[PDB]
Amino acid sequence: SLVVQEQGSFQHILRLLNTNVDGNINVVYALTTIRGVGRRYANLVCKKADVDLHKRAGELTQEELERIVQIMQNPTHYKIPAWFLNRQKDVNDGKDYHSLANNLESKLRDDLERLKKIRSHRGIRHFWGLRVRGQHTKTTGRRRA
Amino acid sequence: QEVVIHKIRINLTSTKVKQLENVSANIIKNAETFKLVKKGPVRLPTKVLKISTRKTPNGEGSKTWDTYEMRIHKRYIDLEAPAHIVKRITQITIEPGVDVEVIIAA
């Protein structure tokens, strides 16, 4: 809509949630780049914040960033339906929750560990370093981790 | 005394086409003889039943197919005419192959 007038040049590459938010580009894109946030989720976050998706937003404000962080942290406090999440329904009798960065990775690791402990078919597969979701490796994917 | 017109549709369904046509003609003639108000022999879209089948039993060799098909021919004759007359019509004009059938209820 408008070309960025004024001096500009407000920080190339911001650091947020122990990860690299890329300068310029767009808020959603930055979120995606973070290890744990995706596209739709990012969009939702942006909407919640109340910033234009048109703006490149490496020239973002601090308050806005803080708000975003808060949103990331908390599903239930803000208006997020709580079945839109990465994780939901976990531990004994309790609540749905998700992380979005380093935190997300940690959570994933924990989950993996739990699975391993359980020794479920999926867990076993994971341990092996193999195909959890029953896809046929008779022909396909001949290299693997 | 009665002269009670129920408004009666004669259906005429078949595979064999010529025969069906003949039957229809006969019906029309009968109607003319009896001199009634009727809509002429309406012809509905010929529904075709298609069975595609691999020509083989064992599925070995080239992959050849046979589309076997059945032609259904469906005609309507709408009579603005009494019950007795309809009955009479039903009684006379019955041929082999054609499925003569009456709706009766407008």
Partner: protein, 141 residues
């Protein structure tokens, strides 16, 4: 009572029925005017017959078309064909023959079918192949 004709137009499975009448000068299609159509590039094509004729002929004649079948382009083509037909038909009916002849000549000169209905219907996609003529893919390795 008024002088009128129903002229059909066609392309592949697309079908158009153009009702030509006397009056002010409507050229309508599915209720909406001639100007829209809305493939937008082929609006010109739709116009084309009219342009060839001249706007003078539509000051008397009133065309309103109903279109079915086909895709979009095909439909447009059908409509165009119908339009081409309709004027000619009208001329044949209620106007001098000379004019009609002239129109025909014009059409021939810029013949993108128009009066002649398009000959081509699609081929059956016979077995052993994804299209009609095209086959799958042999391998003897």
């Amino acid at each position: 009572t008024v002088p009128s004709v129903q002229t059909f137009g066609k392309k592949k499975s697309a079908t158009a029925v153009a009702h030509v009448k006397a009056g002010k000068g409507l050229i309508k299609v599915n209720g909406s005017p001639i100007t829209l159509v809305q493939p937008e590039i082929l609006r010109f094509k739709v116009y084309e017959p009219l342009l060839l004729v001249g706007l003078d002929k539509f000051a008397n004649i009133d065309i309103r078309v109903k279109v079915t079948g086909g895709g979009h382009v095909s439909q447009v083509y059908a409509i165009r064909q119908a339009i081409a037909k309709g004027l000619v038909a009208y001329h044949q009916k209620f106007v001098d023959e000379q004019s009609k002849n002239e129109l025909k000549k014009a059409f021939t000169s810029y013949d993108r079918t128009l009066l002649i209905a398009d000959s081509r219907r699609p081929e059956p996609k016979k077995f052993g192949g994804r299209g009609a003529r095209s086959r799958f893919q042999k391998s003897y390795r």
